[PDB]
Amino acid sequence: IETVPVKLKPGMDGPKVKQWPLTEEKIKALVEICTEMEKEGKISKIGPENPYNTPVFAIKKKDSTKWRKLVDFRELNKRTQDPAGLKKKKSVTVLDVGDAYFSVPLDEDFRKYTAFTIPSINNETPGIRYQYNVLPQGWKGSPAIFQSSMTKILEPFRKQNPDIVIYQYVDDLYVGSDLEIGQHRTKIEELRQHLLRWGELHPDKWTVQPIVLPEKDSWTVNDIQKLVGKLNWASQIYPGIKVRQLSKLLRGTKALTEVIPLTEEAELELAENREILKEPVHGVYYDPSKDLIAEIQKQGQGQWTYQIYQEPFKNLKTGKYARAHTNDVKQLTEAVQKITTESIVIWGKTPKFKLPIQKETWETWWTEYWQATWIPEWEFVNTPPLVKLWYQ
Amino acid sequence: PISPIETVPVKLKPGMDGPKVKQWPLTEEKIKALVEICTEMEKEGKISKIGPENPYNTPVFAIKKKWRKLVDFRELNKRTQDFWEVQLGIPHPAGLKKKKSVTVLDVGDAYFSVPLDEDFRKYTAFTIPIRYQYNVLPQGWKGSPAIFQSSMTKILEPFRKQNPDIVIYQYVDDLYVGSDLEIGQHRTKIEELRQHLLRWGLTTPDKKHQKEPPFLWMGYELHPDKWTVQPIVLPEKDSWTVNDICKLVGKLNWASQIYPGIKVRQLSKLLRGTKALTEVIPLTEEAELELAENREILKEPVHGVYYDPSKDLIAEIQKQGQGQWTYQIYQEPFKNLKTGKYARMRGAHTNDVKQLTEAVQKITTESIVIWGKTPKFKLPIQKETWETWWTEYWQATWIPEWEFVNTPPLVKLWYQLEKEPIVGAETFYVDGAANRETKLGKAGYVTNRGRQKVVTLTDTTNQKTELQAIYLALQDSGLEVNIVTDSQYALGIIQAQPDQSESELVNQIIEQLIKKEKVYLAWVPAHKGIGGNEQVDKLVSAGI
DNA sequence: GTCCCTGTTCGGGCGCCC
DNA sequence: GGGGCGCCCGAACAGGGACT
Ligand SMILES: Nc1nc(=O)n([C@@H]2CS[C@H](COP(=O)(O)OP(=O)(O)OP(=O)(O)O)O2)cc1F
Ligand SMILES: [Mg+2]
Numbered sequence: 010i011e012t013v014p015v016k017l018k019p020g021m022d023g024p025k026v027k028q029w030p031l032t033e034e035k036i037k038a039l040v041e042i043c044t045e046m047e048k049e050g051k052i053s054k055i056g057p058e059n060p061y062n063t064p065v066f067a068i069k070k071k072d073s074t075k076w077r078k079l080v081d082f083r084e085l086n087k088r089t090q091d092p093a094g095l096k097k098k099k100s101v102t103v104l105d106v107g108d109a110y111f112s113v114p115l116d117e118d119f120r121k122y123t124a125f126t127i128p129s130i131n132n133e134t135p136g137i138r139y140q141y142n143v144l145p146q147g148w149k150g151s152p153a154i155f156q157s158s159m160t161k162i163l164e165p166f167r168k169q170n171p172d173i174v175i176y177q178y179v180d181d182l183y184v185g186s187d188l189e190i191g192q193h194r195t196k197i198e199e200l201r202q203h204l205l206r207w208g209e210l211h212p213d214k215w216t217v218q219p220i221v222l223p224e225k226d227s228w229t230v231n232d233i234q235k236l237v238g239k240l241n242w243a244s245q246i247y248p249g250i251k252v253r254q255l256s257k258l259l260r261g262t263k264a265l266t267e268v269i270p271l272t273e274e275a276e277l278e279l280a281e282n283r284e285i286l287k288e289p290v291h292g293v294y295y296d297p298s299k300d301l302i303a304e305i306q307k308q309g310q311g312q313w314t315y316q317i318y319q320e321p322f323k324n325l326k327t328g329k330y331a332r333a334h335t336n337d338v339k340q341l342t343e344a345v346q347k348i349t350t351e352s353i354v355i356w357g358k359t360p361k362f363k364l365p366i367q368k369e370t371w372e373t374w375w376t377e378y379w380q381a382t383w384i385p386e387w388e389f390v391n392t393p394p395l396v397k398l399w400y401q
Numbered sequence: 402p403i404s405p406i407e408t409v410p411v412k413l414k415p416g417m418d419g420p421k422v423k424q425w426p427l428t429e430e431k432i433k434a435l436v437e438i439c440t441e442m443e444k445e446g447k448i449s450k451i452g453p454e455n456p457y458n459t460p461v462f463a464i465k466k467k468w469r470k471l472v473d474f475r476e477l478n479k480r481t482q483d484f485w486e487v488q489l490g491i492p493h494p495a496g497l498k499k500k501k502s503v504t505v506l507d508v509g510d511a512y513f514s515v516p517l518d519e520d521f522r523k524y525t526a527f528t529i530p531i532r533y534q535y536n537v538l539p540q541g542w543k544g545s546p547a548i549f550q551s552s553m554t555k556i557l558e559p560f561r562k563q564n565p566d567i568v569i570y571q572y573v574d575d576l577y578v579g580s581d582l583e584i585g586q587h588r589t590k591i592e593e594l595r596q597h598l599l600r601w602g603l604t605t606p607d608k609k610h611q612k613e614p615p616f617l618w619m620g621y622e623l624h625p626d627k628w629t630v631q632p633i634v635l636p637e638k639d640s641w642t643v644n645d646i647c648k649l650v651g652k653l654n655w656a657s658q659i660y661p662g663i664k665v666r667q668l669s670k671l672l673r674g675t676k677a678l679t680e681v682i683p684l685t686e687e688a689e690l691e692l693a694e695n696r697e698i699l700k701e702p703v704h705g706v707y708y709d710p711s712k713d714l715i716a717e718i719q720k721q722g723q724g725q726w727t728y729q730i731y732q733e734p735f736k737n738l739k740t741g742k743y744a745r746m747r748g749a750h751t752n753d754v755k756q757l758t759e760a761v762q763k764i765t766t767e768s769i770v771i772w773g774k775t776p777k778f779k780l781p782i783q784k785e786t787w788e789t790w791w792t793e794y795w796q797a798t799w800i801p802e803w804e805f806v807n808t809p810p811l812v813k814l815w816y817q818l819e820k821e822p823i824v825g826a827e828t829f830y831v832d833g834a835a836n837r838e839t840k841l842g843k844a845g846y847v848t849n850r851g852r853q854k855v856v857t858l859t860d861t862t863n864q865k866t867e868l869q870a871i872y873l874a875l876q877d878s879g880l881e882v883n884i885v886t887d888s889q890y891a892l893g894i895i896q897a898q899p900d901q902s903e904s905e906l907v908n909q910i911i912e913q914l915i916k917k918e919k920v921y922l923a924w925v926p927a928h929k930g931i932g933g934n935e936q937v938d939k940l941v942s943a944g945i
Numbered sequence: 946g947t948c949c950c951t952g953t954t955c956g957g958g959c960g961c962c963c
Numbered sequence: 964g965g966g967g968c969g970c971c972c973g974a975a976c977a978g979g980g981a982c983t
Contacts, residue, residue, distance in 0.1 A: 416953095488963095491961080491962065492962095507963095511963090546963085549963095572962070572963065573961065573962080573963040574963065575962085619961085619962055619963085620961060620962060641948060643958085644957090644958080644959075646959090647958065647959035647960080648959065648960075649959095650959065651958095651959045651960025651961080652958075652959090652961090652962060653960090654959095654961090655960055655961055672958090677946095678959090720955095747952095748951085748952085749950075749951065749952095803963060837947075837949095862949060862950085863946080863948085863949075864949060864950065878958070890949090890950080
């Protein structure tokens with residue numbers, strides 16, 4: 010085999026991202042995996058004269074005593090030059106075809122940008138640095154360069170099983186069928202066998218979370234005040250929402266716990282608004298040259314709400330994620346893995362997340378709960394407590 | 402002597418060229434030491450005499466340790482390529498395990514034993530007032546540390562492979578070597594390590610070969626069952642300057658790793674207005690008092706222990722007021738592995754539950770660096786205070802495994818906003834407006850019982866008037882109050898339950914909230930003619 | 946757009962190690 | 964003169980809300 014040249018986008022350096030502290034577990038696993046990869050020629054030791062760096066860690070998959078190395082290539086990916094039926098299937102299995110990539114060499118003059126560093130416990134030693142000689146798992150370029158080789162492999166299986174949808178996303182193969190679960194699994198095993206000789210999701214059970222208005226036999230000034238603020242916000246998403254009649258009940262300067270009987274108008278306006286919320290959002294077109302943005306709100310009691318959009322108030326999807334000794338960060342981490350999965354399946358792209366958590370909290374613990382082979386972009390926000398009421 | 406290791410290839414930054422800089426005048430005490438050093442180096446191949454075919458030059462000088470030769474490559478360092486530093490942190494004694502046998506070796510003339518890339522030697526040209534260049538790593542170049550540290554690691558890698566159960570802590574040219582052998586057999590391994598280094602050109606002078614406890618290492622003294630910091634001494638000036646307090650801040654911080662209780666808030670608050678290092682500063686009573694407290698805890702004798710991987714790590718946190726926190730980490734009670742402080746103020750407004758959650762995060766990260774695992778925590782906060790906070794709070798927040806410790810001052814939430822509006826509590830509709838032009842404002846309220854107040858403010862901001870109005874409603878209400886606001890800004894601050902703030906005004910608001918039996922704060926959208934948010938809007942906007 | 950207020954980064958100084 | 968980590972501080976952004 011001979012390599013494919015690869016460039017960065019013009020006016021861009023390679024990544025220079027500092028390695029973060031790893032646990033003893035993860036370091037032991039990384040050192041194991043790396044020495045073997047260095048035997049098999051997939052990575053080489055390098056020096057400090059290579060100025061590039063990219064974080065590494067490792068995840069303990071399932072219960073299995075098998076670790077998976079995971080390189081955070083988000084930066085490098087940002088800097089690397091540049092299947093509708095799948096969401097319908099009864100079952101989707103996700104396969105990890107990452108190691109296939111190690112069979113293709115990698116443009117020599119590019120290898121230096123794939124540098125990473127293994128830390129030691131208590132800084133017994135300086136870091137050990139490696140760079141890749143082959144297509145690295147997690148890199149944007151790896152499925153690209155390997156596509157033609159991936160197609161050649163799959164093409165016969167696709168022929169023999171035309172009802173089956175196979176989608177690839179970096180290290181991942183999504184395999185969808187309408188088979189009952191036993192024959193599905195048997196087919197997956199069949200596709201695995203086919204893959205060997207070269208070298209559980211349920212999409213149409215994905216519900217959306219509608220905005221919904223409370224029902225009450227008596228309304229206080231407070232109740233109505235909450236209602237009108239909520240409607241007034243929602244009207245930014247559903248311009249047919251109307252608040253005029255209801256608001257007119259709050260003329261005067263009244264006690265919060267004073268009871269207000271609703272007029273005929275106000276009941277009608279409330280009835281309309283109830284219906285308008287049913288009617289699906291209009292005029293939202295997925296734009297693949299724009300970021301997918303995800304917001305998550307903590308609702309409490311293991312309840313999480315999310316929306317995916319690209320323009321403010323123009324939601325592509327809105328959802329809920331539900332689950333004593335609950336672990337918020339775990340839950341959040343699991344929520345963003347779930348949302349990312351949906352987002353890949355529906356649009357083949359990974360959303361930028363707005364996380365309702367302090368940076369240090371998140372960065373302290375999220376690798377403890379991560380099970381995906383990809384990592385989405387994210388940023389940290391201070392949720393104005395208004396919006397957590399809006400998706401109540 | 403000179404390592405036969407491969408040189409590390411190194412470049413200038415694109416489109417740049419070597420330094421051309423005049424050697425500044427130098428005392429003869431130094432010139433004598435220079436040529437003494439240079440005649441030997443030149444004899445040994447480490448520096449070569451150059452001619453006039455070398456355009457470049459860089460100033461050199463010396464300081465006493467014997468003498469250390471230095472080169473002010475600040476200009477070369479600017480033109481050189483970037484390096485990824487391989488030194489990720491500083492080994493700490495509390496992460497060492499008990500070893501049967503221990504050695505500490507220093508490597509002799511370390512840098513000068515590692516060859517410098519040939520194609521790069523020319524740029525290192527320097528002139529004694531005689532012209533030379535470097536054939537080995539120079540002290541002052543920014544590439545020398547990483548190239549040394551990396552070369553050292555290549556050199557130790559075979560020995561480490563062959564001897565996986567000998568532990569070598571490698572800090573620049575410093576080696577701590579620990580084994581579970583008897584001293585006889587340990588010493589045989591040491592010798593094997595020294596001949597290994599000598600094969601690669603690195604000598605280990607017996608002069609710096611420590612064979613008996615207490616070992617001197619990284620600023621500590623290592624005894625077989627305990628460790629201590631090397632003596633710390635604080636200045637005793639009467640007049641203090643910026644640069645003096647910094648020396649005191651820094652030294653206290655360093656002490657805080659093993660001396661429990663250290664605090665540096667007030668001392669630090671001093672260094673705020675300053676624009677230059679020379680300024681002297683009045684040691685405020687708050688600060689002068691702190692000094693003595695610290696100064697007192699230093700007099701007592703103190704030591705950490707080593708790490709037993711087969712027991713648990715325990716971190717125990719204590720609160721010290723003014724956003725100051727101290728901790729101790731141990732496996733067995735009153736036998737500290739180490740200690741620390743946390744004192745960072747994050748946010749304009751915060752409470753003690755957040756700060757405690759930040760101390761936990763810090764300690765967790767630090768523990769992962771040193772021991773590679775998370776400790777179990779012991780915290781001055783009720784399991785039920787925590788759950789209240791975790792419930793109501795809108796952010797994901799979490800604390801790893803922990804038990805309560807009733808060692809006051811206990812961490813507590815100082816007030817709680819009601820979830821439902823209060824019956825028999827007067828309803829205040831507050832609001833503020835400000836003029837961006839004149840900076841003039843108004844804050845006021847209107848209440849369901851007919852009360853109405855408007856206060857005019859000067860030199861204010863919109864957000865401020867909005868907080869002023871809330872404060873005003875708190876001031877003129879009974880022990881139970883409903884307040885309706887249209888400010889996300891104000892609602893956002895108060896709903897997160899701060900007990901401390903950078904803002905005097907928010908502090909005053911906080912004090913009111915604690916006085917009250919019941920507060921219910923509610924939000925409405927502005928300019929939507931909600932009554933009587935609508936009625937108080939007219940009032941505070943008039944003339945504004 | 947502008948001001949305001951809040952957050953983050955990143956470069957000062959000092960400590961400590963080599 | 965160099966590299967590392969730590970601590971504190973203030974400068975320069977980057978956001979989102981409220982306003983003419
Ligand atoms: N202030 C320092 N600047 C440095 O560049 N170094 C570097 C990093 S470690 C290396 C030590 O060099 P040397 O071995 O000649 O130092 P040394 O005289 O302390 O040790 P030795 O007497 O040669 O065994 O110098 C050390 C310093 F303390
Ligand atoms: Mg030495």
